[PDB]
Amino acid sequence: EITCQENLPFTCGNTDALNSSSFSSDFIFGVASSAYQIEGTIGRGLNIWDGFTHRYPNKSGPDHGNGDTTCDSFSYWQKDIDVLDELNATGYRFSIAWSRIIPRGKRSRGVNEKGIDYYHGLISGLIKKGITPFVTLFHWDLPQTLQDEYEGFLDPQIIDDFKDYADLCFEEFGDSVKYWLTINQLYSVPTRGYGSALDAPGRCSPTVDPSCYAGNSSTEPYIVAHHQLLAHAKVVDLYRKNYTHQGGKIGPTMITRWFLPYNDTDRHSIAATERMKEFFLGWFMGPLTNGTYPQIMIDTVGERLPSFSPEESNLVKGSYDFLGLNYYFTQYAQPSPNPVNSTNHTAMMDAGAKLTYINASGHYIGPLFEKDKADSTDNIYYYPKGIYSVMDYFKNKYYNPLIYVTENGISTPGDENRNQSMLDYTRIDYLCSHLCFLNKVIKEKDVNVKGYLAWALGDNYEFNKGFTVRFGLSYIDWNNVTDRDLKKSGQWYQSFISP
């Protein structure tokens, strides 16, 4: 019987009690990163994260930081491999920058052979240290040219351009890469990029944010979500029909959260909780497992929800070998109105739920996850048992999928100094508490989870936050980015992996 803690103080930092041997022998342990966040713009074309962060610098982060140079993994990719080698990691999730290998977006316009060689060298270096690559084709960094030609994922033209890009990656790297991710966190771009305009490309309704250059927060999230599923399923079909000889697997990435009722004896809050599961996970998991959106979405969203043709439904249904599940936290849900006729209506209001970290009796769900200095009532809190609840739900609701945990981690403030930054005990507590529950859910519920990749390998540019928060297991000095030095967390993870 496995007992895991839910509240501070935790004791899972002790490698005598929890380590890699607690898990099956073939289980993969590593870390993750993304191209915009770590490489720098040297050697690549421009993408919508470059566009968004330069056009709307106060949305890039409070320091106006961006990915122009960041930790310079373009130059220091060998140092990333060295961190992984130090950890004795068996996996590394990284993304390919579309704009580094096809700067002009559409593959018929030509490829950047030097950009292809950059990834060849990385992949070869990983494999030579025994590290299995998990490669994300699209981690939000769409070539700027495609957004300007047709508004990227807002248009169905994106399916064929994404397909041709994916084909080039499979042709070039698939002899060595056996685990591919298509689109990072399907829920994110639609909602933050086209609903709230917190993320690139920064579209939304005029009264939601007057700085959006265009958009409609009520309709566009649904259009983008739909084209994301079609483009993902087209690439999966391509992979499975034309690259089956490479012996690899492919899947989407979901951002996952667990949801609990704000008031667990109030039927209205209980209903809002179940609505949240459908609108946040089922929006994509319904199409991925059944080829249709959830009935509550069909009913509520009405004419604003696109339909799949029979051919598209068949293409999208079952379009995964595995699921990359990212997990960070859990929210309480209570009812909220859905004012569809308001000019500031957003797709996110369709779920009819208001999300908090404090329930109706004043209980905070768990330890502090992220402090919000502008508004402290907006602090985010974590909940280690949520990873257990998510995994169990995916096995039970979504046909017992093979799962890899593709992201899991916590930030510490960028205002801390080096020493404080290195002594990141809050990060050991977060990582170990979630690893305990993950082991518990694998053993108790038999969820087919086969790996775990913590967010992040090193400090990087954080979407929306600049360099004001740090997520790395390895520290990077922004005045001289060459080195990546294991933090207390990285050292702890090293001993968890090789106890």
Place this chain on the structure above:
Amino acid sequence: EITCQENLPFTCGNTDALNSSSFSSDFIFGVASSAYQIEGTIGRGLNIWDGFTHRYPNKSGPDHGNGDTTCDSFSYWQKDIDVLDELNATGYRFSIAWSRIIPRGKRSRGVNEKGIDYYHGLISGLIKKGITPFVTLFHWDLPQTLQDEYEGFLDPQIIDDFKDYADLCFEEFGDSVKYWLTINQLYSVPTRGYGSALDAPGRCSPTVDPSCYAGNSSTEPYIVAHHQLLAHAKVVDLYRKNYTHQGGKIGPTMITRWFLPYNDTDRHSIAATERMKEFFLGWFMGPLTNGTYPQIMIDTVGERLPSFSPEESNLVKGSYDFLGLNYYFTQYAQPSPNPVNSTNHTAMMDAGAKLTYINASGHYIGPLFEKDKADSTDNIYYYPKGIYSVMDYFKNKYYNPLIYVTENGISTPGDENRNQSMLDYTRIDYLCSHLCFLNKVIKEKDVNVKGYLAWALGDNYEFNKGFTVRFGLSYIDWNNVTDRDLKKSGQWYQSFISP
């Protein structure tokens, strides 16, 4: 009789001897700037200078600086108007960022109304202080989307996109703007952008620079030059047929240089000097005055020189109301081989000339213009009489055009400290020595020159050099860019204007 000095020391800094009253009463005096160099990326889409400086940071300048924030004329445009008001300037040359008003390049994709309002406010502010705007439509900052769709000026698709962009500018601002420039320095993009790859977009032959993403240095300069002339002439036709009611004038910008023989008794060097005039000025001035390229270019460049159809020849011939002439320096010319079959052949070798600042007897042409710290034998030297020689040549060879001097100025090192930077006596000597010759040529040769705009209003990002050189008449502190403080040069120019 006017006597002007050619060698240090100069005495034209004395406003008793040379001032604005030395020139006709209607003569316009001011300063100039360009959008990429001063505004910052806030509020606009991305262009090829953003692309080039981020993809090839060591080509952006030795400090890797770029135009991301620069002096923040987006925020501080009122402070630029204040500098002009302090100078009692009567003209200001600025450029419109295509990417600020049409971020998606093609006008049918929509316009950025807030970007239009930015220029409305500037123009209105200038006119209210009695300053005549001279507005450059294209100062090299092509929306990145157009370079990625069809390689910008390499393709004839650029003509109609440039035309639609120009139309929008005339419609929006032409009721107030009466002097328009089409393309800044026609010789520059073809040669530096597509021949040497020193400038965006950074194309060239593989053995010229292995870092070019594509190109051909022998052919591409000619293609781009040709499309530049066609796009320029299309816009001029549009202006003169559809916006004649606005009562304004339009013209191209040429970079001008004078050329002297390396050895003035050697017929080979004399021939190389005359070749240089044709290949550097006649490349564009031949088409602009006659609808054909110079015969020496037709003969030497052969199949690599495009031909104008009769319709295109007619469109391009006479396509100017005035000429914007930029002038900085003069070179000696001697013969050099033209190895057309070499893989590193460039369009610039077609002239069969090698350019220096020192003649065959060891005479340096004039005072120091720019020091080159990597290689001192590469220092550039200036020649005040060259402005006289250029103006006289344009009147005599090119049908007595109306001319405005659209750029003239000198850099000082970015390594100097504030105090040294402010005491920019070398800049007063450069500006006054050229103004003396300009007055002399207007009086002696009756050249129809009606204004002079010194390069630059303030310190900015310098193409190819970052923030390592300063060209401003007003100082900007890079640790806090709000203020623009008149240097010794700006104060001298203030007294030259209002003695």
